[PDB]
Design a protein around this motif. Sequence first.
Motif: not given
Lengths: 48, 159, 186, 166
Positions: B104-124
Amino acid sequence: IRENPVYEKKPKREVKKKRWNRPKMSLAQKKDRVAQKKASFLRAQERA
Amino acid sequence: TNTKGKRRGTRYMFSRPFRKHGVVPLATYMRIYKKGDIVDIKGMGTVQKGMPHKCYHGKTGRVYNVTQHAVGIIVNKQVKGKILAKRINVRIEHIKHSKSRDSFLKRVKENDQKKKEAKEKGTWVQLKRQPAPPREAHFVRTNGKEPELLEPIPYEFMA
Amino acid sequence: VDIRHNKDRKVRRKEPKSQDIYLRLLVKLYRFLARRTNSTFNQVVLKRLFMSRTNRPPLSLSRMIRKMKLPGRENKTAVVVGTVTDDVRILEVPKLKVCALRVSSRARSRILKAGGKILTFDQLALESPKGRGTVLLSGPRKGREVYRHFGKAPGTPHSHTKPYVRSKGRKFERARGRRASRGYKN
Amino acid sequence: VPAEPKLAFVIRIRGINGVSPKVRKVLQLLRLRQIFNGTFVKLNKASINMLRIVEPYIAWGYPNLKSVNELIYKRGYGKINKKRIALTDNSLIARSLGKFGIICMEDLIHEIYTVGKRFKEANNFLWPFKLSSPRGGMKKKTTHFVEGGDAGNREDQINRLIRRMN
RNA sequence: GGCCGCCCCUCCCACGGCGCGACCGCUCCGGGGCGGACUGUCCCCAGUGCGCCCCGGGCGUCGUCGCGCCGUCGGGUCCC
RNA sequence: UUAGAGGUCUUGGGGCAUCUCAACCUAUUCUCAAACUUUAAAUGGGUAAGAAGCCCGGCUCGCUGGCGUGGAGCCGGGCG
RNA sequence: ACCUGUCAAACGGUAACGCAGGUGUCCUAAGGCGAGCUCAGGGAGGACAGAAACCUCCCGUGGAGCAGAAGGGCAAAAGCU
RNA sequence: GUCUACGGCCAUACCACCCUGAACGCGCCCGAUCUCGUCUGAUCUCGGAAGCUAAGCAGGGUCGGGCCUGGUUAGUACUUGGAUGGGAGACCGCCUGGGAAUACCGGGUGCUGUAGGCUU
């Protein structure tokens, strides 16, 4: 020792990779060896 | 009635596995348990000190205290219709880290980083897990080969 | 079909158990205010008018001064659905606007001598129909003797709850179970 | 091979006498608290394994466009402020479901049938359907459909059953 | 005004099918020269795999890239 | 716990230079276990699936300590 | 009033004048620590010596021992000195 | 290509026998004044450096035993849930889901971390 305890590592030298040990025989070699050992036994017993 | 002995019926649960007796491997003593992490309790019969009771074998709890050789654990126990949080002291040999929390701690990490990548790339991007959806429509090619015709076999009385 | 009925009827007060006609007139007034106004203040006041006396503990003058001295509470009306009692351990009383059902005579004298104002709930409705600029206070609900006896039983290991004891002394429930030298002490 | 269906209609076909605790729990999670109550269920691995638990107690299948139309139009009620309110005007749908884009009975039918986003809200808004007894009778309530009975997954035959209970 | 109704047409996209090349990955039923082990036909013998090394063939779910051709009460507020 | 088979040191026996049995060993074979087991289900039981979270910056400690160590606590800030 | 295995249906709990058994003790060490060793059994040898005295080499995963019954655990151990 | 010191996982690493081992190392090896311990300098402890890879150790080999892994056994055995199924019973079949284990047949036979050497 007290004046200079620091260790200077021996410089690594590049050398030609020469095998000093036998590599493992493959499946083909192991199976072939049994084939010719069987054939030699049949041939020798036929000659005698 | 039967006895109230502490190790009654632990003939197999506290026995060592086949061809795994002898010296306890030393990495079990090298595992590091902090306050707040989740551990699985599994009693080992090689070490008779700090042994958990049989009702906690197979149970999972979280560390609330760390001592020199043991760990305090808050473990849920069901007692006749109520669940209570017991505190037990177990030596290190009888516990190990629980891998469910690590996943679960790994999934939190990949979620937070995917939010940052999505915001920087303007995607969902999808972040919630979803149950296995119904299989999508697809084509199945025969490759010019007819399906093999199966048929029930006759009955035969064997030995 | 296939339901449970043991929790269908909610147990709460929908009216005061009292027959006091003056409380019934304030309940009539604040029943109208809770309905025709979107204020949640009028709803809370209406609930507390129904509540029993044990659920409306007296509010000490010292505690109201404590709570009305917090920042941003200046020039606000302290509202108590209950009795405002006097505290003799407080020596200086500032000016306060307090609305309460009952005020003890000495509390009313000290509040008025300080320059404050005492209101009833009908004057509070006329001045603040919405409940604007008020501090809704309450007395300590568990600050009475019965709660020292409640909870985990006295003869149970980590319990600090008062037993029901007829008289207090060395000979009254102090030997066995309260002492390692007499049986045990948990 | 077509996509396996995403929508199911589930009808409770058994009473409330002598139900095991696990089957009882799943049935009230499906909102089938009464016999001949029906509901739409979104199909995924989580829900399908739930339907396998209650198999002897339900008769379910894959509804078609006519089935979802007749159910919503003829005996479709809304859960408005915890009340069972008949869907007589489109205003009732718009007040409770308009924030999601559902403002009429056509939007709610499209929402249920072509199941997608906001199916949870549209379906939970619908009160569990109170269907009548099946006109013409049943075959065998205590046996699975593939054995000449009633229970389980009649995949497309559920529409024949809906015509007789609605 | 717009769309649909019949005729050469016209572009893009989607699905399916048929071919043509290029690229990539696995494989040998393969060829040619460099080192290691094997055989009671071992000096004149006979095999076995392994490294660079380029040609030949196959497969890759029917890979990727494009190019054509055929089908659709196909889609584009029914493309122009 | 059943039956044959192949060998032999035999503090073994019997019929007579001995030879068969028995014993032991080895490779097989028939049949079994609630208080046996290498293996090992189905149905079970526990935990987790975030804002009490995550990520930055600083302060405290008499605990720990090669260390700017470690652990815990506390104070700010950002992220729905 | 207690303990072991099983019953007991692979978490825990689970009954009968169910089954198989043990207890009202024993130990200044058989408590604690350290060091050094390896046990049962078997093979082959050696004066009296033989099926069993003691000496030597080899094999030995524990098939011994750890006081009490049983289950678990244990090998430069928890066993022996 | 390998070794040494300390290890992790504890046989894909063990066991039996055969072949090979350059250079460093690891050993076998020589000795008992000192430290130390023995019936015995065998072991242990200490001081060495004439010889040797015979042994340990490393690598390889064996239609090797074991071990690991995969097929088969087998959708078999067993099993959650169901029926006003069958059968006198013993038990068995079906619907709905899960699903093993020998014998038998193949493949493999340590990976690796920190520090320090040799392969000049």
